[model samples]
Target: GTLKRAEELKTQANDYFKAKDYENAIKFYSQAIELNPSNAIYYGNRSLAYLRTECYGYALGDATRAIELDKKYIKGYYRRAASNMALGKFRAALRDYETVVKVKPNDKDAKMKYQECSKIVKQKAFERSVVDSLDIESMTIEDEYSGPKLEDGKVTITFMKDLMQWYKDQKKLHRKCAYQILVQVKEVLCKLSTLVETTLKETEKITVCGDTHGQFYDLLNIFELNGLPSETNPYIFNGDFVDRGSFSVEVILTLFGFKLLYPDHFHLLRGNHETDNMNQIYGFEGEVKAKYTAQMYELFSEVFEWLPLAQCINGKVLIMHGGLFSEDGVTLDDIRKIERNRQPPDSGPMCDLLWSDPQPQNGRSVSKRGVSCQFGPDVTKAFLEENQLDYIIRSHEVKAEGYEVAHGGRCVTVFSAPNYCDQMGNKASYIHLQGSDLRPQFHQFTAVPHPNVKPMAYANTLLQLGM
Candidate 1:
């Protein structure tokens, strides 16, 4: 009856596995294993169940035990191969898969697994070769650099003009200028309030743009259409300056140069992607290391950490990278009081400002992105009324029409990345607001041609699912 009961438990485990009840399957499998430790089938099936739950270590242990129980059990090799594969021990997976194939030549699953792992190993080696070259330490940033130089290592309008042209022609800037520019911008940002407060004089019009995402050529197009950033032609680029596209270095340097050039007139807000984590996974860190050095990338990270979180123009219109806060009654003073000089925390005013999105319905919902919550129209309305603000402007999600006016014309989203990732076939736009009438006037534009480098050129190759 003990042996019979073990078989009954094994059947129950098998039933639970078929229903995808992995917890119950594990429960019965453990009971079967304790009752009949000598059964190789029990170990083999238990390993498969553990693999479903991504418990690779337990799966591996059970697989090994199964193989020890019966060397001829081909299923044990299959379970071990899957565990190794899940753990990214591709070589071990391939070895076991190879064993499964030789022993059970009719097993098509083992053959496919072996072939898949073979491709992975080969691709991993190829990625290593490519990635090392991407990080190849070149002394092009040396003191005697023959690249376009910043006159007197200062960021003047003439130097900026020359720098943009040089970047257009694919020339690198002197590391000295890069260093000086980043440090100076860091200085400028350090003194700025977390919530930037500024008034627009009568007849003063400011151009507010959205995420450029390393689309430098398209950025140049914005300048061509709306004029460049000067004291007279002030601009506020609402964050997400880097990442995705290949020309991230050009995009950031240009934005920083303008910020230094027109300190009061030109503004930059902190975006979610401006942190170290996003840069590491996206393309900024890799792009910077490829063009300059790791030290330069660190400086970029440091400078970004100091960027203001939100900008309140004329005390009526507010602009943040993401939308409003999780809690109600979040005032402009709350934004101003935030101590925002680090990687954003998972929750709070800082995180909400950088990560939240606006939903169409009433009340707050857990974010699909899993970091910050999304607020509804009612939340937007209450926040606007409490702060005595006209509306809020945010730019994070891409839009089909390049811009969106939501929450009964209170929350506005403007995305400036045309043909986003060279996939989303959408136009991009910027908002121009005058002093007295804070109503946004939109100017939409399309994508432009760029250098031949593909987007996400410096991303982690292993995670590339055709980007």
Candidate 2:
């Protein structure tokens, strides 16, 4: 009966782990380990929890203990290998991958991982040998005002100076949360209010834009035509400064420069794709690999974890790049509670914020991509009602109509990258929040004519992975 209880607890621990709930998984796994002190699998599973928590020393100790308990436990070897990879011990990771392949020859995950680690090792070796290039000034923007024109190339980009100017007023207009605004520290906020009348007794309508996946040139077209980010109106750009586009570097630099120049005028919200994993799989990492080489790609990994998540809009709208709840009931403080270190893990509050996608319903959404499970409409209603929030704005999935209104239009999708990769043929779009009603608007842009580049075929590979 004791062993039976242990088995049941271990099974429960695994369910939580697969759902990306490591804390609860650790609890149950620890109980199972206590119940059956001799079970190597229990120790191995607990070690994975330690890994999610970044207790690397404990991770190594537990994994080693599990192997000591069961020398041939394949999982023990794999966990130890992953911990080594996190510590930048690429050679160790390669070795572990090799052993796992030998143990299970048909294990394609191990094989693919082996290839990735080996390639990384080789690239690092070559990079270390080369003399650094002092190439600078070649990276200057030619037309600061006129961005890439979509009709000419296949994409166009136009800086919405007016949009920045409008947000400056909104910052001052908000009765609350305006005190957090840093003037000299941010710089742009200070400059925006110089010429414009800061004392406008007005409430500007701002529909914060989220993640435009490399359809940058389309971004400008949206503003040029939609009167968005206008000098006379307010708008927020939820953070995803780049990736999945050929001009990712250009797009990020332009936005950052603008943020520094007009901090108060333009707002940025964080997104999951802004991280290294998404970028590496999508396209930004490849762009960095091609232009600057692999080192920049790694550096981007560290920078993404350092990004801020929580933002208050007029103290009325609590905005984030992705959904709110998790397998564990997460509060706003839980998200802000994270003391993020060097890199975020595959699971955690931070990861869930970036990696999780919320659908109508409660609990979790059953995802076809094999990550999220289905959430019920009741959960969505409860979260919004509990938070006293009337709307949630996010952009992770592309809709045929460019956006979707869910939970009675309480939550909405806003995608601004039109002709995405020229593959999906999905028109790019954004949302315009008009008061509490929350109406959405769509915009599409032409990609600047460049070489006959195919929409990234890697995306096709990703689609197959879902299968």
Candidate 3:
């Protein structure tokens, strides 16, 4: 009877997985596992559920156990390989892919992954050799301070102006200097994360910007077009300040500096890319590692953990990195109780806040990204009504116009990275909320040429080898 019940639960879990309700799928699969712990296929299916939810570590463990139970399980190997890839364990993934190709030689996708991983391994080997031959100390250059002297660990506006100029050159700071900046910045971010309520209300006008994605020049263009963040001109950056582009260091440092200089005026929210797992696969981890050290990359992750998940603008517009609730009727109070200073979870309210997207229909669906749920028109309408808000403003997906309105303009997606990945050719935009009227006014612009290298040039050179 136990085995029969477990099989029935597993069948139900499979149905949930097909429907893209991965959290429900995970719960049912866990019950199945508790009842019948010896089943290898059960473990394999749960691993897939974990993978779709971005619980990569859990996926890896389950997949490994599945392989241990049944050595010939090709799906187990594939799941394990995918988890490894997400974790930046390219070598291990390559081995798993090789085994898959050996078992099923006709599988073209496995063969392609094998080749890609092989190339990545070779590139890293060459990279290590080149680094070992160099003397970092000999190559280090000191930054010339042309502005006011920094005092009391405070980064003054004069200093920031100088720093921005320096960053525009795309020159990396020395290791020790970079470490110092990260330490100071992380300290500031920790305090900033706590200074705000779950929702914010203001009578003054504020500028709302979307995902810059390390487009430093475009960010500057935003400042020019919409005015810089100041006591009089407050701004809320909706998240995704880093990753993808080559200038993430510059982008993040500038924003952190601005936040410190104008604490109440400059707001930042966390995005899905802020997590260690996402950064590991995306450009941020590799970029920081290449420029500085693995420790610096970890420090950035620490800072990201402290960022707020969402913001309420003027008590009318809800600003977050991603859109509405996965389940129905999530309250503002639910978001208020969310604990800060931790990595975002694979499922639940925190995950949904940072990862969910909007769908055209009136009910929830599966996100194409596989990690977050896809909430629909009804979800947005219900959420705004529950929260007593006028609209929801989010940033995640890239739009050709730099902004998109959905759910009949109840939700807006604003992507601020122009020419995304240096190839998307999309315009970037920022929203202006002025006067007593809280309606969003979008100002869109195209990519501007920079004196530095192209977007994603630094990180893509390493990651594309595995593509």
Question: What 10-residue stretch in candidate 3 is worst by lDDT?
Answer: 128-137
State the displacement of the C-alpha of residue 74, model 3, in Å, after optimal TM-score superposition.
15
Query: For candidate 3, lDDT tens digit of each residue in 121-214?
Result: 6866763212233342354344763333344546677767777767767665455445555566666666653225432344567888888878
User: Which pairs clash (backbone N, Cα, C closer than 3 Å) in model 3?
Assistant: 246-456
Number of backbone collisions per candidate: 0, 34, 1
Candidate 3 total steric clashes: 1
Model 2: which ten-residue window has the lowest total lDDT?
171-180
lDDT tens readout by residue for model 1, 129-231 = 1112322224236656556556565678878788889889888887767877887788899999999987898889999999999998999999998888899
Candidate 1: stretches off by over 4 Å? 1-147
Best by lDDT: 1
Model 2 residue 211 distance off true place after TM-score fit, in angstroms: 2.6
Question: Candidate 1: global Cα-lDDT?
Answer: 0.83
Please tell me which model should have the higher TM-score, number 2 or number 3: 3
Residue by residue across 258-367, what tens digits does model 2's lDDT show?
44444455555557667654565456777656655564455445444445564554434556666555554555556555665334465556655554566655566434
On lDDT, the stronger of 1 and 3 is: 1
